[PDB]
Amino acid sequence: PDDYSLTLPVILELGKDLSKLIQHKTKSGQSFVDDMIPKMRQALYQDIGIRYPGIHVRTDSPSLEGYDYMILLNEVPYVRGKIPPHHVLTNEVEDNLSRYNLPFITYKNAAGLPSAWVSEDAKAILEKAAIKYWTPLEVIILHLSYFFHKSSQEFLGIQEVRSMIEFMERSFPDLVKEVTRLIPLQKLTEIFKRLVQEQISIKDLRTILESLSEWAQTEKDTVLLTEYVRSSLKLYISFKFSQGQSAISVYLLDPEIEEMIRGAIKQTSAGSYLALDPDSVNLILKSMRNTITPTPQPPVLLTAIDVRRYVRKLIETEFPDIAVISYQEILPEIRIQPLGRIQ
Amino acid sequence: PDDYSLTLPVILELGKDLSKLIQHKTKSGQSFVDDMIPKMRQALYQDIGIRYPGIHVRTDSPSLEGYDYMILLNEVPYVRGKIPPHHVLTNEVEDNLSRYNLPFITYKNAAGLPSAWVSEDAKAILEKAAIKYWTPLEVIILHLSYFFHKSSQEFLGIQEVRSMIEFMERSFPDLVKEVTRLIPLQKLTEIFKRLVQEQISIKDLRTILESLSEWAQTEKDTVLLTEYVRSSLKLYISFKFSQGQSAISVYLLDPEIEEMIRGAIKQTSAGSYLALDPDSVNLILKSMRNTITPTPQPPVLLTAIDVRRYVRKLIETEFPDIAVISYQEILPEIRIQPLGRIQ
């Protein structure tokens, strides 16, 4: 009646028609709310450390267009989106679609999503040309998943990290003890947050904790401890950023740029930051814009060990999805296919 | 659901046909999952001082061909492999097989494993000729064993070392009490890990603990404690690297090299550095390359007591499998056969 209520972390509101739409089942007899959304949460938990909250679905939204949907983060609207009626979504090129495929509607719901919508009546031909397509419900799932991917910091806090560490305690009481006797819980969560901010999964807790148990005996800096955990994930990072190929394809930095960055460190009374020379930062960004070819996959930038974290923070603003990795973080025997040298 | 899952250390994924294959007991009635894998684990735990994890077997994998298999370390793919259909593996010289009118398929699954595959129809012939062969299931076990051996450090951490010390506590309460009173669990874990990192078995926990119980009264450096444990395993080391003969075959160092290494940074830093000139490290590495005739078993490099650990930390990157031993680790009556110094 008049107790407090906890704010709901994620709301999905649907217009009258999409609400009418979540009543069917896919050709595989699965439910949007009981199967598709849980499987998305499960996939996200496998892709990075986080166990993301459930999705509260509000049907027949009054403030919504029947074919519109809205995502609310902590009961505040985060993103609106639209579904072109009676279509399926596609990721096809603009010269390939000039293969008599009439519906070339471009409407981008989000950055990381496809935008080439095609009539549902064309499913048959889409399946005959090896064109993958997403049904409108699957597009909603794509967008929810993208949302979770870009906003991990919103769902990985002190309580959530503690819950995962406690689960670890059941079979690793002594490793956790050795990890809780050196790094207090708040510092631990800061470290996990830095990891997932750069798409480093924190799912392999035994590896990460074993790493911290080693490096936390000597170093207390949370940023450095994070670097070490990264260097502990050689197999994972190599497999992820090489996309499972025999060779990681990366961009490099001209040694001149690296040494120039190296010469901009700070005194670490509190922390050591980048003494970003304005004009030099805008010159490195310009060389990156004019060297890294745009993408459909995000590109990978391989740098020296001692500058990687700085390169990330120098570039994270314009190139937020570019992965900056270091030699300390790839397998010793890994094949490297250089693509360019930023100058 | 809402709950976490513990990452699986070892997954073996099998295509359709290999999956069918593990459903049949061998000629002698043993099961791939119930007998072969357990016995391999027991053997590894008999050679190295590690208890290796169980293997989770995923059949009818979607991403694998009928005769393909994959090994995942902590749910990241480690390696992929093939089995030539309806064949058995042999180590025969290819030219000899040809001379026996036996068509052969060449395929090397992992480093140091045989590669001459022969139709299973040839078993009888191979038996009468006393030619060794491995069935497909046996080859998967061979590759699994190579994997576990290369990945030992992945299974030897704080919780696992604690588990060992626990088992030791049941019959050696006071010896454990003496060692753990002097060495914390994390330091103990470091020492065991150093031992297996250089192929020294930690199966004889009584000898290792007794050694530590003696030397931890006086010495706290974990590296020096490790050296002492190494010298306490004289019998094990002599038998292993002499391969059981009345004489160990070794390479030696020039007195000039030993004296030159002997300039080593030993500060009060819980472990001493080794400050040798870069070009000098490259001159010792060059002399080793030009003096170590490659091996068809690994070679042994015999050094003086006070330089052994440094010699290792100097050659381990380019010469990773060379066993570096000292006069302190071999039996006094084991005859030293010298294969030339290092210029």
Numbering used by the authors:
A (entry chain E), B (entry chain D): 363 to 658, 662 to 708
Sentences copied from the publication:
The export apparatus is composed of a central, nonameric, ring-shaped inner membrane protein, termed the export gate (CdsV in Chlamydia species and SctV in universal nomenclature). The export gate does not directly engage the sorting complex, but is linked to the ATPase by SctO, an ~140 Å coiled-coil that is structurally similar to the central stalk proteins of the rotary ATPases- the F1-ATPase γ-subunit and the V1-ATPase D subunit. In T3SS, SctO is the key link between the export gate and the ATPase and is poised to transmit mechanical force between the ATPase and the export gate. Presented in this manuscript are structures of the C-terminal region of the export gate from Chlamydia pneumoniae (CdsV), both in an unliganded form and when bound to residues 25–110 of the Chlamydial SctO (CdsO).
The crystallized protein contains residues 345–710 of CdsV from Chlamydia pneumoniae; several N- and C-terminal residues from most monomers could not be resolved from electron density difference maps. CdsVC displays the same fold as homologs MxiA from Shigella flexneri, InvA from Salmonella typhimurium, and FlhA monomers from S. typhimurium, Bacillus subtilis, and Helicobacter pylori, with four distinct subdomains (subdomains 1–4). Monomers of CdsVC align with RMS deviations of 0.26–1.68 Å; the primary differences across the nine subunits exist in subdomains 2 and 4, and in particular, the cleft formed between subdomain 4 of neighboring CdsV protomers, as evidenced by the high B-factors observed in the structure. The closed, planar ring is stabilized by the buried surface area between subdomains 1 and 3, with an average total interaction area of 1127 Å2, as well as several salt bridges and hydrogen bonds between conserved residues, as noted for MxiA. Residues lining the inner surface of the ring, which correspond to subdomain 3, are highly evolutionarily conserved across prokaryotes with T3S injectisome machinery and flagellar T3S, while residues along the outside surface (subdomain 2) are highly variable. This suggests a conserved functional role, such as substrate secretion, for residues lining the pore, while divergence of the outer surface may allow the export gate platform to form multiple species-specific interactions. As was shown for MxiA, conserved residues lining the CdsVC pore also include several lysines and arginines, which are critical for secretion. Density for the loop connecting helices 12 and 13 is observed in the CdsVC:CdsO25-110 complex but is unresolved or only partially resolved in the structure of CdsVC alone, despite this structure being at higher resolution than the CdsVC:CdsO25-110 complex, further supporting the idea that these clefts are flexible and become more stable when ligands are bound.
